[PDB]
Scaffold this active site. Sequence first.
Site, mmCIF file in Angstrom:
data_model
loop_
_atom_site.group_PDB
_atom_site.id
_atom_site.type_symbol
_atom_site.label_atom_id
_atom_site.label_comp_id
_atom_site.label_asym_id
_atom_site.label_seq_id
_atom_site.Cartn_x
_atom_site.Cartn_y
_atom_site.Cartn_z
ATOM 1 N N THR B 42 0.838 -1.189 0.000
ATOM 2 C CA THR B 42 0.000 0.000 0.000
ATOM 3 C C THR B 42 0.884 1.254 0.000
ATOM 4 O OG1 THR B 42 -1.698 1.216 1.236
ATOM 5 C CG2 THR B 42 -0.127 -0.103 2.489
ATOM 6 N N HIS B 47 5.375 -0.397 7.646
ATOM 7 C CA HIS B 47 5.527 0.508 8.768
ATOM 8 C C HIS B 47 5.265 -0.265 10.057
ATOM 9 C CE1 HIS B 47 1.153 0.622 9.041
ATOM 10 N NE2 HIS B 47 1.091 0.988 7.773
ATOM 11 N N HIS B 50 2.861 -3.136 10.539
ATOM 12 C CA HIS B 50 3.110 -4.503 10.063
ATOM 13 C C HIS B 50 4.159 -5.246 10.897
ATOM 14 C CE1 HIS B 50 2.144 -1.894 6.563
ATOM 15 N NE2 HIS B 50 1.394 -2.908 6.162
ATOM 16 N N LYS B 84 -12.039 -0.945 7.487
ATOM 17 C CA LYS B 84 -11.653 0.359 6.940
ATOM 18 C C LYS B 84 -12.917 1.197 6.734
ATOM 19 C CE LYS B 84 -8.785 -2.004 5.559
ATOM 20 N NZ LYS B 84 -7.912 -3.134 6.024
ATOM 21 N N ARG B 88 -10.232 2.333 -0.408
ATOM 22 C CA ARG B 88 -8.804 2.619 -0.546
ATOM 23 C C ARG B 88 -8.507 3.120 -1.955
ATOM 24 N NH1 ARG B 88 -6.094 -2.558 2.679
ATOM 25 N NH2 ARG B 88 -5.320 -1.039 4.223
ATOM 26 N N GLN B 178 -7.726 -13.226 -1.079
ATOM 27 C CA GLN B 178 -6.929 -13.694 0.055
ATOM 28 C C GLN B 178 -7.330 -15.128 0.462
ATOM 29 O OE1 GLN B 178 -6.185 -11.001 3.245
ATOM 30 N NE2 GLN B 178 -5.692 -12.589 4.750
ATOM 31 N N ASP B 199 -7.488 -7.372 12.222
ATOM 32 C CA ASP B 199 -8.514 -7.072 11.228
ATOM 33 C C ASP B 199 -8.579 -8.148 10.132
ATOM 34 O OD1 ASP B 199 -5.928 -6.374 10.357
ATOM 35 O OD2 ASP B 199 -6.759 -5.067 8.800
ATOM 36 N N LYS B 234 -3.690 6.334 18.683
ATOM 37 C CA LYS B 234 -3.234 5.360 17.693
ATOM 38 C C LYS B 234 -1.732 5.037 17.732
ATOM 39 C CE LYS B 234 -3.153 4.609 12.660
ATOM 40 N NZ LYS B 234 -3.827 3.289 12.736
ATOM 41 N N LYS B 237 1.399 5.962 15.007
ATOM 42 C CA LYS B 237 0.972 7.188 14.343
ATOM 43 C C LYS B 237 1.576 8.404 15.038
ATOM 44 C CE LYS B 237 -3.060 10.218 14.597
ATOM 45 N NZ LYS B 237 -4.482 10.309 15.050
ATOM 46 N N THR B 238 2.246 9.255 14.270
ATOM 47 C CA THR B 238 2.852 10.457 14.826
ATOM 48 C C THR B 238 2.332 11.671 14.059
ATOM 49 O OG1 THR B 238 4.785 10.482 13.335
ATOM 50 C CG2 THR B 238 4.965 9.165 15.344
HETATM 51 N N1 LIG Z 1 -4.897 -8.545 3.668
HETATM 52 C C1 LIG Z 1 -3.674 -8.518 4.520
HETATM 53 C C2 LIG Z 1 -2.434 -8.813 3.676
HETATM 54 C C3 LIG Z 1 -2.528 -10.145 2.976
HETATM 55 C C4 LIG Z 1 -2.607 -10.213 1.586
HETATM 56 C C5 LIG Z 1 -2.730 -11.447 0.931
HETATM 57 C C6 LIG Z 1 -2.770 -12.620 1.673
HETATM 58 O O1 LIG Z 1 -2.869 -13.819 1.010
HETATM 59 C C7 LIG Z 1 -2.693 -12.588 3.065
HETATM 60 C C8 LIG Z 1 -2.570 -11.345 3.710
HETATM 61 C C9 LIG Z 1 -3.523 -7.153 5.173
HETATM 62 O O2 LIG Z 1 -4.268 -6.227 4.777
HETATM 63 O O3 LIG Z 1 -2.655 -7.044 6.063
#
Ligand SMILES: N[C@@H](Cc1ccc(O)cc1)C(=O)O
Lengths: 321, 321
Positions: B42, B47, B50, B84, B88, B178, B199, B234, B237-238
């Site tokens: 993204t 960051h 993750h 969300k 996006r 996914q 999430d 959060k 987040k800064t």
């Molecule tokens: N959807 C996950 C990232 C992800 C992408 C593909 C996958 O197969 C698995 C996880 C996220 O937003 O963090």
Amino acid sequence: ASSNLIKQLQERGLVAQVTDEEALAERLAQGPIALVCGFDPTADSLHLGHLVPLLCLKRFQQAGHKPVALVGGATGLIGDPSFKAAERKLNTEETVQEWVDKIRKQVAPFLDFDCGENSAIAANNYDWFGNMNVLTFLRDIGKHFSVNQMINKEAVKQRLNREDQGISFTEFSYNLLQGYDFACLNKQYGVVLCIGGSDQWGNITSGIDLTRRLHQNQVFGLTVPLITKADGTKFGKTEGGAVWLDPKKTSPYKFYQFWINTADADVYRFLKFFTFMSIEEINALEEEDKNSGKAPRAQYVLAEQVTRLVHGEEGLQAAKR
Amino acid sequence: ASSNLIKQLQERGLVAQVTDEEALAERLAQGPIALVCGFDPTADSLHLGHLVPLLCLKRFQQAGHKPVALVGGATGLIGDPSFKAAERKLNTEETVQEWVDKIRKQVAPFLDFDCGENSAIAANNYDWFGNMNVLTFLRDIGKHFSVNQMINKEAVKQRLNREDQGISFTEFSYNLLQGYDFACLNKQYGVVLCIGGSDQWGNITSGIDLTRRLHQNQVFGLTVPLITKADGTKFGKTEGGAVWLDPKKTSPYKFYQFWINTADADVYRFLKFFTFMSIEEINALEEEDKNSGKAPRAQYVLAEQVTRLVHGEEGLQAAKR
Ligand SMILES: N[C@@H](Cc1ccc(O)cc1)C(=O)O
Ligand SMILES: N[C@@H](Cc1ccc(O)cc1)C(=O)O
């Protein structure tokens, strides 16, 4: 006073719904337009359920417009859930490909492909979906669809408020495929009107909205009524199943017999839906049957008219032997 | 008494949810397994948001398991709507392709790609979605998804009960992409566990169900908690935005400073989430700070530990100049 095409089809009881009738009628007056009606290969032949929309395509052509007969080589691999109680069976690519050619050839005789600029065009949405990447579809087409809107679409609403009727993501996506068909046909052939059966309203309006979003062109939709019988039973449905337009599946003789069996309460309405006899002639025939102390001759007229339309003079003759 | 891995991660407060914990714990005891955690491009860098899932992948590897680090070359072209508020932004293919390589290289140093059979594997779902036809996706994958189920999935529920939050068909389809990633990775690498941020529950369980439907294999899911700060603000987040793992976006010095600034109420919990110090050592450090009449040294320990983990010894040294 040739009031106008939409009006004339209305008199026939052939207009169930239409988007901005005033705007459509003015557009039709501007000159000949290209319009489309689609048919999905759910079998190796169309049946009576597809006849009214098909002949309606012919009515537009006779008024000078250009009909595009779309066969769903791709949509037939997905299945339209519109007002359907259960998930449709998924057919294989090989089988649908074969059904597509059969249906295309079955549709051709109904339209004029040799009359100048308003000559008919045969289309297949497999041309653009057949090799479209999934990411392209989801992004370039999918971004324009609100799921909130899709779920309260009448055609699938009942499948969502279930306890006996669910819907797969596969059939739920059908609306985008047909919606894009409209936008794609508008772009390549200038199609500005899509007609279809009554259960097609939401699929058609999605096409109208997507054509606006993608190409900024205003297009229209018109649905024909779902054919009903006065006795409340299902039209085109018999003990032996559907009444096919394919002579090898339903003989011209059996087809002619199906029409002869038409109930008195339905026959005059059916003359309007299924034949090209003028409204004046149909009304006079109704009056004639009312005042004669003879068997009504409307059933014979109907049987003769539709059998010829569907199987030509040869079929009509085979119906008497 | 090495109770077990799930238990040990629980003590760290790193297990938000887990599918059939009993069955998963027994499976882990059977031998090393392949597991996956995915990351979507993204931005051109990951960051702090993750980091916990990433280090958790490392915790599994240290326990002898094989981590698959999946970078979403295809999913990043769709966008995950999970919890969300708004749609996006759609990035271009060219940009995401570039972000994918950046993120892959950023993830590598965190895992061991040279330790035998449990060596890490880098994966990209663009490999299987990049050229997948839309009809194939809708049929072969889409047929296994109930829209009724999809719409009451917690991750998107709020987007459907709107008046200020709608969802496109594009993001609504993300769950299937996914879900198939899990089934595809199970088939090629034997992946039987997927871990992810909090999430990610619904996306993960969709993968579990689809792997069962497609391959008849039982697989598992585990989510880590969403990191929170005692003051309710959060995490990660800064004023200047996100705290990036890329030294060119967020310098090691600034990164070290971010950790030094950790509140007393969060620091011990953060030591558990972000470092490999034993629980025993962290508890003793908490006690030590409680009884010393000195500035707590936990912040310094945390800053030192995470900075080294993320930017190595060189980064740690750059943090003091
Ligand atoms: N959807 C996950 C990232 C992800 C992408 C593909 C996958 O197969 C698995 C996880 C996220 O937003 O963090
Ligand atoms: N969905 C229509 C057929 C159709 C298919 C594709 C289209 O683009 C238009 C119409 C039906 O079920 O009758």
